[PDB]
Design a binder for this molecule. Structure first.
Ligand SMILES: *[C@H](C)[C@H]1/C(=C/c2[nH]c(/C=C3N=C(/C=C4\NC(=O)C(CC)=C4C)C(C)=C\3CCC(=O)O)c(CCC(=O)O)c2C)NC(=O)[C@@H]1C
Ligand SMILES: *[C@H](C)[C@H]1/C(=C/c2[nH]c(/C=C3N=C(/C=C4\NC(=O)C(CC)=C4C)C(C)=C\3CCC(=O)O)c(CCC(=O)O)c2C)NC(=O)[C@@H]1C
Ligand SMILES: *[C@H](C)[C@H]1/C(=C/c2[nH]c(/C=C3N=C(/C=C4\NC(=O)C(CC)=C4C)C(C)=C\3CCC(=O)O)c(CCC(=O)O)c2C)NC(=O)[C@@H]1C
Ligand SMILES: *[C@H](C)[C@H]1/C(=C/c2[nH]c(/C=C3N=C(/C=C4\NC(=O)C(CC)=C4C)C(C)=C\3CCC(=O)O)c(CCC(=O)O)c2C)NC(=O)[C@@H]1C
Ligand SMILES: CCC1=C(C)/C(=C/C2=NC(=C\c3[nH]c(/C=C4\NC(=O)[C@H](C)[C@H]4CC)c(C)c3CCC(=O)O)/C(CCC(=O)O)=C2C)NC1=O
Ligand SMILES: CCC1=C(C)/C(=C/C2=NC(=C\c3[nH]c(/C=C4\NC(=O)[C@H](C)[C@H]4CC)c(C)c3CCC(=O)O)/C(CCC(=O)O)=C2C)NC1=O
Ligand SMILES: CCC1=C(C)/C(=C/C2=NC(=C\c3[nH]c(/C=C4\NC(=O)[C@H](C)[C@H]4CC)c(C)c3CCC(=O)O)/C(CCC(=O)O)=C2C)NC1=O
Ligand SMILES: CCC1=C(C)/C(=C/C2=NC(=C\c3[nH]c(/C=C4\NC(=O)[C@H](C)[C@H]4CC)c(C)c3CCC(=O)O)/C(CCC(=O)O)=C2C)NC1=O
Ligand SMILES: CCC1=C(C)/C(=C/C2=NC(=C\c3[nH]c(/C=C4\NC(=O)[C@H](C)[C@H]4CC)c(C)c3CCC(=O)O)/C(CCC(=O)O)=C2C)NC1=O
Lengths: 161, 169, 48, 160, 161, 160, 160, 161, 160, 160, 161
């Protein structure tokens, strides 16, 4: 993986120089809002099984994918979709503390496009679900960290698109 | 595209053989139904512009979950596009009814249709119901036209069902 | 390049070794040594 | 169906179908008209079943309907009747197929991961199937209740 | 994987409705021909070591391929060629017992260009072995059962070329 | 076939099946029993046609058989009767289909590049299939030899 | 504890424990005279925390008090305070341990099994625990509930 | 593997009593001298490859035991007994931070008696090596914590002899 | 960094982050101002460190200056002082990142096979870091020498 | 050969070759000037061997060439003498390798499954090889008896 | 896999013939150099940390491929690169000892050109490394056996380029 410090560090390591003051400025901004994210990560892990229930009833339930024909009609295929959304809540909260979307890149979004297209999983319903989920976590953490949590959700929906 | 005659050609060409007794009797089985194939294909196109209109009003009266703002048949931008995208399923069912097998359906309409509808958000679910409403509403005008009916003319349609819809069991 | 794979599928694989000693033919032959055709199997016998 | 699980149990042993299992297939095909008579009487009274078994579920567990729990109004109680309509539909599919593999791949794999996310009790679904068992076996014949009810207990083993 | 029973109750599941009289007539069309297949699947299962024996002597034996310079020369290659033929009888009886060539798209037509090309197997001798095997099988099983079995042999070699 | 060619033309204009191609197809399919008892007699006498046109070719073109020609030697002139065995075998596929898309996709579209790469003269095949036509019109009756002889006459136009 | 989790992690790397983690044990021992006020305050209000958070839970989910749920009756609402007191008898074992190693092995590891095996939905159990850790945060200071409330809210996501 | 903090947790839940007053001064005794242990355990890691410099060089290096014929004469038996002394230092420092010898009899003392009587290892050479490495640590952590480290060193020698 | 041990050791169990490990995150972002002042002062006198700790190293181990050794001549000792400046830079990364891991990946996991392929002694550079920590902890403050001197202590204790 | 499996035994441990087996390669290559001298004697009198090994076989087991047996016919012996002629080709491959893996990879591995399929008895082809062993050891002297008969032994003990 | 004896058997097996007088001199040219190659391998293995030392000393050290803006720079990537150069030498010992490059084409040249573009390491420096390894080796072993070792060096360089 990679972390926001270990991306600022590795930017100044392949150049070989020491710690620049712009990089030192790029580390103080991580430490100024580091106290906000560490309280933000507990409040999502408290409600991590709760958010997915509040997300899937916002935009997927009583609709045409959990009805005969859709990909969540078979009720032991809809159980894949709940733990498919358990990953994108877990790894986004990993990427909030990392300060870096590089958790999502080579672990989640590397072969995510090829898995969904080799199954007929609707891309356009997944981005319909994850952008619906982004409103729910911003309601539970507040509008301060909802800008921070909204970035890494939008990184998931961008690379999946 | 690939007729029931020409499917039996490369069923026999690739093994390098002539036309034997099994070739001469399976092909005669296609030709004895060919009068019943063509006259059923006339009366399917008797009111084919009406036949999509009677089906989709019977669809959307059965699944309102596609008129009220939900899944995409909402505006007439969607609805008149829905009647066109319905009309390809009626029109290509005429071709494979005459052609014998479903290989015209295999590489004109079926390939990419799981991937076109997923890119738009069009559900595959009621499309199967839309062919399932056209399944029996095609047999009515064959029955009221005096054509006998049977597996031929009621098969092209479930080959658009059993291969388009995803396997559950 | 995606491909729509089924609910249960079997990829067909080649036995690295003897040709008949694939486990799809005889499941009672998978405990055997692969012999001179396959790779070298190691085992621990002598403990100091 | 009974053809499928006589193949995937014979493909793991990697040999042909022995005649110890081919006679059960040979007795299945000649008994085809019996199972359609089970199925058509099952689906012919689909409003008699769920309206009776919905009451017998709520006498066994009145806490789904009382204020605080899961199903309310005529919306959330109605989708509880939708799932019982599904499982009544899903149990006549295994009766015609003669095997529990079509109810397996649709609904005997993974709901213990699913219903806890939905907030419904899993065991209160299972008490709805036992009321569905006693309604349909009272409606069906005396011999086929040991056959149609031989699928009804398999849903109880799924949840409970 | 599915058969004539589990294609009907798959296609009638996914429309949401129950089993209807248009689809029960498709089951009775399979139940009328079910007794023909169980007699057909029994006789091939008692002659699986002998249909392969004659069909190799029909087209493969005393050829270039049996001789050195051909492919089935070494004893090691030879047995395999019986074994890589013996799946084509066992899986063709399964699809004959199914009434659907959905097994054959799934277990025995995956690598069947790419395994045989990456092993020196000629494709054109396997297709010539199979209609040499279909002629002795339809002679063994009868005229009526020979054309139902004849679909699933010609389903294989059409997909194999 | 004609039935593919009537669909594929009607698919390109994106209309339904016309009253034109409804009657080309219906007139084809009521001649379907007539063409198969044309095409059986070619396959019923395939050892006579190949032997007679093999006798008819090599007296017309003795540069082929003479040494330094291509079909010289008992293994090579056995292949030229096999080289004509395929084209008689293809013509029976064209008589059954009612068109020459079995002839076109299998035996036409790369002929002159192949026979230049093999050393044979290309027009010497065009005499041989023309000699194969002259024994095929002596098999059939007169009103059918105009039908089956046109499929021979298509194959001459592909060669030369 | 936080001492115990560090040394088993350093055994996996087969080296000594790192100076990054040796800050934390040094930070744990200067806050070892900070953790003990949280432990003694829960002694003085364990009859007050549980007796308020039950009625906070029963106003949130009154399906329990209805006849048919798993705690109906005065003998049955004993355990629905006693199992809540048992979870209040778990945090003070791990406030002074710093982390979740007494939380797991007494509370978490099979808690999906036994509440299913007793019939109680854990979503109601996690609701009152969430109702408990709103009152305990209001009882403690703003600095105490800043870290112990983060430690409180582990168990709700761990149970359901 | 459990420390003194978990041990007083272990002896408090099992009898039905809460976190009482008598458990706190067991923890406050840990919290008083726990600052001493982090000053101790860092400096052992400064000399963890330097105590074993002195381990051979005080009691093992120029002796008759290393002379051909003794037990510590092979290169496969030399280097196997520096790691067997290095592990005895590292697991002591875990117990130096545990306040508890209950990491020793799970991972060190489980099969250590019988593996020395069977492999020809003299017991008296190890306790003349381990107790010799008690006092060199007394010059590195100060007076008091080496007497704390002498408890677990004697717990090795009570559990080895 | 601090997250890079914690985001991996909780991903491998596929759970969310335990609030004992959220102490480790909290535990420093309060120290990130104190961790940044020390590496600014370490870089700010990075010429005086290498010219002093490189100097009296050769009064302690004079073998590598001597002929027959590796760093004979000024053209190799200035190449030798590159690795002193590299390891001084790798100290300052590890103090800012907060723990053991960035100095481990960049400059540790090949040094028993890098230095053996170079033929240089692996123990003598381990003597130099103890003098590099001698001049550094001689110039910084007293309270950070228990922090910044311990990040020196790791790259000693895994070198030799 | 010896060299192609001394590689593989040294490759799977990722080592270079030990000098114990470098003696085994060096003693093998100076034995190469005499082992091919055995193989030139063997291929020089193959028709003296194969005709004599046929007549020493068919007197011993006369049922296979008497009709009702598998090798009955004028040409069916001529394949079955050729099927025994192949093992004389492989033993001369096994002589010049100093080994038995060219016997193994070519003429051992599926030899039970061929003759089960074709119908010849598996011991009856093994009795020809020991009949071939008695004449080919009579071709040579004493010091080439055991060096040729060892590879004759391995083909007997594998098939039987 | 195969060597100079196994290949000339397998060249003369698939023709169906015996070992003629046109293939025995392929063996006799191998057996004449049989004593030459075994002395060539036993000086490779005694110097195998010095052939890889002197090879990188002419190409890679003190360049700017080991600069901080470089591929080699982190010591994880150094010790792989000596080891990725170890596996080119050790198999080149094998193919010289076998007399056939088939062991190179199975394990070394398996997918090596397509791994390197997938990693980002340069190929044009690697051919400079092995051709620096070739000039060290032929001086050490001898100008006879350095010629036959130079073929199997450049056979790797033909496969990389
Ligand atoms: C749920 C809201 C959406 C949905 C889900 C769905 N997914 C699958 C199948 C798979 N999902 C994955 C997911 C991942 N693999 C990864 O490596 C990562 C990164 C950590 C993720 C998130 C995988 C591997 C599978 C398939 C393997 C398998 O056989 O299960 C299904 C099953 C599809 C099917 O037909 O079997 C479903 C339903 N689909 C939706 O409709 C929602 C938008
Ligand atoms: C008749 C006096 C009133 C009326 C009745 C009516 N409409 C329909 C069907 C549809 N109406 C729409 C409407 C719109 N589409 C648009 O894009 C817009 C602009 C935003 C509007 C207002 C559509 C798409 C349909 C077809 C789908 C459907 O069934 O709703 C019906 C049903 C016809 C049938 O039975 O097939 C009826 C009775 N429409 C009017 O304008 C009058 C107010
Ligand atoms: C209406 C009853 C159903 C429905 C239809 C719907 N379809 C579209 C869009 C498209 N449909 C196609 C399909 C085909 N194109 C082909 O060439 C073939 C083979 C002949 C088929 C089957 C395509 C390509 C589109 C995209 C637009 C286009 O034609 O270029 C829409 C529009 C989606 C939107 O909202 O814009 C709709 C509404 N949707 C339903 O809900 C019904 C089930
Ligand atoms: C009713 C007796 C019990 C009950 C039902 C209940 N279910 C839901 C929501 C869902 N139920 C399903 C289940 C299935 N869908 C299927 O397609 C199949 C197989 C054919 C099954 C078993 C699913 C997917 C959902 C979610 C969306 C949907 O309704 O399809 C609810 C609503 C819960 C909510 O929060 O909205 C209810 C009430 N619950 C009970 O309490 C009864 C014990
Ligand atoms: C059903 C799933 C399945 C597939 C696709 C399958 C294919 C298959 N065919 C193979 C071999 C082979 N197959 C043949 C083929 C033949 N003999 C002939 O003469 C004909 C030309 C031809 C077939 C009629 C040969 C000649 C070899 C190679 C055996 C080897 O070299 O190891 C091998 C390698 C043998 C091994 O496993 O090591 C596989 C895997 N096996 C399977 O279990
Ligand atoms: C983590 C806890 C732990 C400890 C402490 C431990 C010791 C241990 N010491 C062993 C051997 C050994 N131990 C010694 C010990 C010594 N040699 C001497 O000169 C002195 C008497 C003594 C100095 C320490 C020797 C010589 C052997 C190898 C026996 C042999 O030479 O064959 C072995 C047998 C395997 C082997 O090393 O070959 C174990 C398992 N193992 C553990 O898992
Ligand atoms: C990022 C991790 C890392 C480090 C730290 C590193 C050092 C490094 N040391 C080098 C050489 C060297 N480094 C040394 C250094 C020493 N030998 C001694 O005796 C002393 C113990 C020590 C210095 C006081 C010597 C002597 C050479 C030359 C080796 C030779 O000439 O054979 C070189 C090649 C020369 C150059 O590029 O200028 C590098 C890249 N390389 C790395 O990849
Ligand atoms: C070098 C590896 C190798 C082996 C093992 C091999 C065996 C072999 N033996 C064969 C036939 C045969 N082999 C025999 C052999 C015998 N009949 C007897 O009764 C005797 C026991 C025995 C020999 C002494 C007979 C009768 C046939 C003809 C079988 C038939 O046509 O039914 C055939 C089929 C004919 C052909 O393809 O040419 C093969 C492939 N070929 C090979 O290339
Ligand atoms: C014989 C069978 C065999 C092959 C083919 C083999 C290849 C091989 N070389 C590799 C890497 C490597 N290859 C190089 C390349 C070089 N070193 C340099 O610095 C130069 C630029 C260049 C050669 C002169 C480097 C730097 C890596 C490490 C790449 C990395 O860690 O990112 C890797 C990636 C391994 C890893 O990085 O974790 C493989 C698999 N190992 C094997 O056992």
């Amino acid at each position: 993986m990679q972390d926001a410090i270990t991306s600022v560090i590795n930017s100044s390591d392949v150049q070989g120089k020491y710690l620049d003051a712009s990089a030192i400025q790029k580390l103080k901004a991580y430490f100024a809002t580091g106290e906000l994210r560490v309280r933000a990560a507990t409040t999502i892990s408290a409600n991590a099984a709760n958010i997915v229930k509040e997300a899937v009833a916002k935009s997927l339930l009583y609709s045409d994918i959990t009805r005969p024909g859709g990909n969540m009609y078979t009720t032991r295929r809809y159980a894949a979709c709940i733990r498919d959304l358990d990953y994108y809540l877990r790894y986004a909260t990993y990427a909030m503390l990392a300060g870096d979307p590089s958790i999502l890149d080579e672990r989640v979004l590397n072969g995510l496009k090829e898995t969904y297209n080799s199954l007929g999983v609707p891309i356009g319903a997944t981005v319909q679900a994850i952008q619906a989920m982004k409103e729910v976590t911003a309601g539970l953490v507040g509008a301060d960290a909802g800008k921070e949590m909204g970035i890494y959700f939008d990184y998931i929906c961008s690379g999946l698109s | 595209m690939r007729d029931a005659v020409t499917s039996l050609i490369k069923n026999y060409d690739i093994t390098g053989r002539y036309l034997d007794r099994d070739a001469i009797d399976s092909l005669k089985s296609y030709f004895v139904t060919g009068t019943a194939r063509v006259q059923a294909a006339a009366t399917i196109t008797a009111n084919a512009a009406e036949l999509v209109k009677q089906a989709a009003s019977q669809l959307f009266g059965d699944l309102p979950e596609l008129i009220r703002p939900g899944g995409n048949a909402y505006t007439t931008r969607r609805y008149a596009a829905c009647l066109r995208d319905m009309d390809y399923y009626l029109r290509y069912a005429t071709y494979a009814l005459v052609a014998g097998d479903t290989d015209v359906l295999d590489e004109r309409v079926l390939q990419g249709l799981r991937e076109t509808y997923n890119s738009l958000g069009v559900p595959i679910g009621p499309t199967v119901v839309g062919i399932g409403i056209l399944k029996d509403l095609a047999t009515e005008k064959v029955q009221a036209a005096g054509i006998e009916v049977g597996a031929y003319l009621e098969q092209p349609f479930d080959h658009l069902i059993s291969e388009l819809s995803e396997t559950d069991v | 390049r995606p491909a729509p794979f089924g609910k249960d599928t079997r990829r067909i694989l080649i036995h690295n070794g003897a040709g008949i000693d694939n486990q799809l033919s005889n499941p009672g032959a998978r405990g055997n040594a692969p012999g001179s055709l396959g790779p070298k199997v190691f085992k621990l016998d002598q403990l100091p | 169906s009974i053809v499928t699980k006589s193949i995937v149990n014979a493909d793991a042993e990697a040999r042909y179908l022995s005649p110890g299992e081919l006679d059960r297939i040979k007795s299945f095909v000649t008994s085809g008209e019996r199972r359609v008579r089970i199925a058509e009487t099952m689906t012919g009274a689909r409003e008699r079943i769920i309206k009776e078994a919905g009451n017998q579920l709520f006498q066994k567990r009145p806490d789904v309907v009382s204020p605080g729990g899961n199903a309310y109004g005529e919306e959330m109680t109605a989708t509880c009747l939708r799932d019982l309509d599904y499982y009544l539909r899903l149990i006549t599919y295994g009766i015609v197929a003669g095997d529990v593999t079509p109810i397996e791949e649709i609904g005997v794999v993974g709901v213990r991961e699913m219903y806890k996310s939905l907030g419904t009790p899993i065991e209160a679904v299972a008490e709805g199937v036992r009321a569905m068992k006693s309604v349909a076996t009272s409606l069906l014949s005396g011999e086929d209740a040991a056959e149609a009810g031989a699928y009804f207990d398999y849903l109880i083993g799924a949840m409970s």
